[PDB]
Every structure is written in structure tokens, then in C-alpha cells.
Amino acid sequence: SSSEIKIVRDEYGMPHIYANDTWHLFYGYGYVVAQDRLFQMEMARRSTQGTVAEVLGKDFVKFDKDIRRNYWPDAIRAQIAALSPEDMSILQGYADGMNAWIDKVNTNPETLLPKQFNTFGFTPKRWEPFDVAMIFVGTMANRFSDSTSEIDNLALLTALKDKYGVSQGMAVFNQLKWLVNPSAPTTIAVQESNYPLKFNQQNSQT
């Protein structure tokens, strides 16, 4: 059967999904996530879009503005609109599977709603593809691959220039924040290869 999804859980409660097409496969995944981690997933969804203060109040307004200023949601929706049908099925299947379990939860809340929803006073809403993509962007692109301190570096550099003069302030900056250090222990041994590019380390752009 093309319409069948079989879910088998092991002795540690880990789900295994058996399905025959992409959309059913990721629908199974979505559905067991909604069974196991629905409050965690809903707070992660609010965390990555900056909608926490709607359910938790004034202490999260700064947090939500900071999240919203760091991305451009239309750019993400445009990436989703360019997917082929096979790729789009992954994301749509997953949201649909979650929604099927959220439909049962919102229909029978006396036994199926996660206690924390009662505790924090609000109920789960339905997901779309954008929401599944934003779980991965808000937490992996948007802050595990977004590190810079360039503005603060320039403030340190300026402060070292005042202390030690212009040429000397730059050489101390290179002492404290070197661009490369040839004695660093590397995962690839020098007999296999080295990085070919060389970079300016003089702030030549000013």
C-alpha cells in the first residue's frame, strides 16, 4: 500500500517509519515528533520566529525583536517556493504529519494535551512548511553559523591605536587576535595539504 505508514517503536521508545513515498515517510516522522515533543517543538517554533512574548509576556519583547531583526522571512519563503515537488514533499509531509497529531490533540485535550500547555495557558497551532524550515534556520544557520565581532574588534583596534600609536596599535592587535597561527594543531596534517589563500592583516581597507 501507498497509503500506509507503519510506525514501530523500540524498547527505548525510538520510532521507526516505514512508508513508500516521500510525503508519507516524512508525514510519519512529523506525527511521531508531535507525539513525543510537541511542547518543545512549539517553544522552539516561537523561539525561532520571535513570537514568545505573545504567550509569555513583557520579559520577552527584547528577545522577539532581536530574533526578527536577524533574518528576512520573505527570502526564506522564496527559497521554499523554488523547490521541486520531491523536495517540497519532505517539508510538506512533515508539517502534515504534525498537524494530524495536533488535530487529535485539540479534539481530545483531556487525555492528549501535554501538561505544560495547561501550565503555560495556551494551545498548539498548526504548522506549514515555513515553520519546519525555520526550526533549522533559527537554530543552525541563524545562530550556530552566524558569528562575528567585527564592530567590537574595530573598537579594540582604535583603543590600541590611541594607547600605542598607529603602527604599534596594529601590531598589538595582531598579537591578541592573530589572523592565522602556524603552530595551531590541525585536523588535516601538513603532509596532506595546506590552505592556499593568504589574507591582508593590516586593515588595508581604511
Binding site: S3, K6, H16, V172, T186
Partner: protein
Amino acid sequence: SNMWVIGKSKAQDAKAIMVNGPQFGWYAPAYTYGIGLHGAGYDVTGNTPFAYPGLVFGHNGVISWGSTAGFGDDVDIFAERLSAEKPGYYLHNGKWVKMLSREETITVKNGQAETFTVWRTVHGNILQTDQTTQTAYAKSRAWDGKEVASLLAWTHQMKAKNWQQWTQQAAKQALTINWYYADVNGNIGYVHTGAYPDRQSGHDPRLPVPGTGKWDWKGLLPFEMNPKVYNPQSGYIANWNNSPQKDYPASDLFAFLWGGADRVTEIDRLLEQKPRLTADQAWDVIRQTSRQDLNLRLFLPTLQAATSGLTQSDPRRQLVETLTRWDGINLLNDDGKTWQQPGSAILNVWLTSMLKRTVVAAVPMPFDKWYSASGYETTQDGPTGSLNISVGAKILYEAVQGDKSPIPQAVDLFAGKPQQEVVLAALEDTWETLSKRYGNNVSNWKTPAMALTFRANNFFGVPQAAAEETRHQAEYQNRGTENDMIVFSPTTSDRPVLAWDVVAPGQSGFIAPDGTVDKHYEDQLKMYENFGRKSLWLTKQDVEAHKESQEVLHVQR
């Protein structure tokens, strides 16, 4: 986050062993989510953060994969030129271009809503603006426009059956991430993935560049430039977020450096110690590195040379002899709260004093506060992430190497005094602080161990569980949030692969409305503390044999 991959020539009783320890902090419910996917070209098993569609840690029966943070520089800031008159515009290649903008309303439970505007140029969203200089800073990411494709490369890679197929998917992952490979034939591999900018000559990537047009990136470097190695001559791949390769530049963060003092040396020493390792020995590296003090190795030779001419009754020298007898492995006493030897406390107080006398004194306030931490700072709940060697301490290590360090010492950090005199002064500070709190008999010093908390708040600081759901562990372990091990072609089984993991507190986070906790809510929490692990199943037979329940759905799109 660490990882060690052991190939054919270093493996004992297998062809390849991969051990991964992603370090994101510790949470309740668990950071990652275990999941097996069997259909549509997929046949996979493992666990992945926030149950992403693609599994960051797992295997497909032919190849296995894992990740650590790359920390390459893939973000630069562009200083945009504004105009007092004609606001919302910025100069770019000789014309005044209009910014993209969008309005946002923040709805607040029991408050008034707040609306603000987000601005974006061709370089990226505006971080901050300086009205005085009429400058706005745009953060520009090399991966901008490829977030979704990176999510998809991590999903498609689960189908690869070899190096060549797997590197085609690595070439599409655009974030700065290390990726690791192992396979049934014993091959191993590593790629420092992501999109890196092709910068103009003279661009110093540690500081901002004018956004008026001449400094614009030329494009993105090709995938051939990304550091990668397949079947290395050494027989193994080890990483603890250290540099990928000789001459590769790191993130521009002021607190992040790749220098001669690096914690990956701790993994290297254990893998070079034995000619071959078994799976049980590869797993056991998690326990040693978890408990290892990272600064002993670095500064013990300096301490020894400075106190060599002192007498036996000089307290400074006794502190050094305690350190000389220790191997650096912390172990809890029977009380479950103090460490067996005082070594970490001694290095902590010594290093704080050394940094205040050297690095901190050469830097103007308020930037001196970036370089004063010893690396031991925690609270009662314990570290929020991995233990590392602090920036201050990496800079100090270069200074104590003298002309053996490749980094020019533009300012003498010892300020004209012989090194030994600064080392002995800090050691007198140390003896004064510690003896006052514990007394003079070093042998009965009971210093406080670090603990470990599974927090109810996520890494953003947002609740994802009630506060009582927090779990406490007595021993702090410098190890992955989850650990997983894949062993290919075991001589000890008929199975072609064997794999294990541990996802604590458990698979489920469900609590019924009456307060009944799911059966799999905390069944992995004691396992985690004792360095245990559970089996990961992949084949149908194995899944059926260990099944606890089954649910069948009938759905049509």
C-alpha cells in the same frame, strides 16, 4: 563538540569506528531526537537536533556521518554610507540605492503591542547605525540565500553510498560545519563544509569594510578550496573545533583563536598512544577527555622551571609538586561534591593572577575584561557548555613560549621582568588565597567539583519544559550533549554495522494532563551519567525483534 574517526589501519576488530560528541549544552527534554526512516530511497537510523528532517548523527548501513562546529569566517560587516537628507538610501557603486524595509508588530500577552522596522541593503540586514558618522552596519553572510538548500543537503546525504556521492551533498551544505565520513570498507573522510567569500585583495576579514562598492565580495570560493582529506596517512581524524588545516583562518570573533594551545591535543595523545583501538577503547576516550583538566599540560613545564631553585618548605614549590604528582584527571570524592585533588582550583587561581599581571595590563579598559577569564568560571548549576582553554590563556601560552612562538610579541607581556618572577608572584597570590580558605595542609584540601544541569529553558533562554523538569547530575563531564558510536565490519558479529547512542533524559518529553509522565521520559538519564549506551537498530529483523509497539496509519495526500 568533538569527534574521532578511526580507519582501517588504526582499528582493531573492525574496519572503521566513528565516535561523535556534539556539544550544545544540556536540556530537558533532550536536545536531539532519535528516529529511523525506512522508505522512499532512505534506510537510516540515528538522532538529530530538534528532529530536523535530515539526521545530523547516524548511518545508513553502508556509510556513517557526524558533525562538529566549523568556526570559519563566513560573515563580514559592511559599513554603509548614509545621507542626512534622502534617508532610507545608501550609496552603492555611485548611486543612492533604496533600502528594503518591513514593519513588525510584537504582540505581548498582558501588554501593549510593539512595532518596529527592519532594514536591509544589498549586503544584508542592518545591525546598527551611527547617525553621528551616518554609517549603518550590514551583516553579510556567505550562506544568505542557501539556508533551505543546506537543510536539504543534510537530508539527501543520508542516501549516499560512497565518498563521491557524499561529497556532492557536502558541496551544497553552506553553513560553517565540519562533516565526517566513515564506511563499511573502512574508508574515512572529512570536509570543512560551507560557503566562504572570495574577498578583494587587501580585505582584512577581522574588521568592517566600506559598503560603497569597491570592497564587495567577488563571489564565493569554489568547493575545491574547502579543506578536506580522505584516508589520511595517520589513520584517524580528530577534531574538537580546532583548525581544519595549516593556514586556514578562523572566525573573526575576538574571543576565538586557533593557536598552539588547543584542547584537541588531548584527543590526539590518546589516539597516538596505542597502535590500534577497539570500539570499547574508542568509547572510553569519552570518559578520559570528559574529566581532563585542559590547562595542566600547557603551563606545568613553566611552573616547574620557575620553582626549581626554591626550597622544600616554600609553599609555592609545594603547590607545584602537588601538580607534578597529578595526571590532570578530576574524580569526585565519595561526598558527590568535591574533587579528589586540588589541581584545578590551583590552576584556576594561578591563571587568574597571571592574566591580571600580563594580558589584562597591556589592554586598555574596557577591553581588558575580555582577556581576564581563566576558563574555569561556572555557577552552581555548572558550565552551560564545553570547557575550553580561554583566549587570555591562549595568548599567555604564546608569550611563555618566547621566540618559539610564531606570533611576534609586539608588546612584552611580562613588562621587562623575567618570566619566573611573574610566575612566582602569581604562585604567592595563589597560596595566599587558597590557604586562607582551606588551611595550610594541602593534603586535606576538599575543593568544589563542577556539577551538570539539564535545563528546562532552551539555549535561547526560553522555557521548553516547566522549571521542576530540570535534572541535576553530580559530575560535570566535558562531553557531547549526546554521544553516538558506529562500528563498521565488526569481526565480533555477523552484522556489517553496529551502532549505539544515548539521548538523555529520554526519547519522550510527554506528560499527560493528569501529571502522568511517559514511560520513556527519563529512562536514559542514569545511562548518561555512567558512560553507558543503548543499541541503535537499522534492519527490519532487528527492529521487529526489539519492538515494544506498533501503529499503522492509512492516509492519502
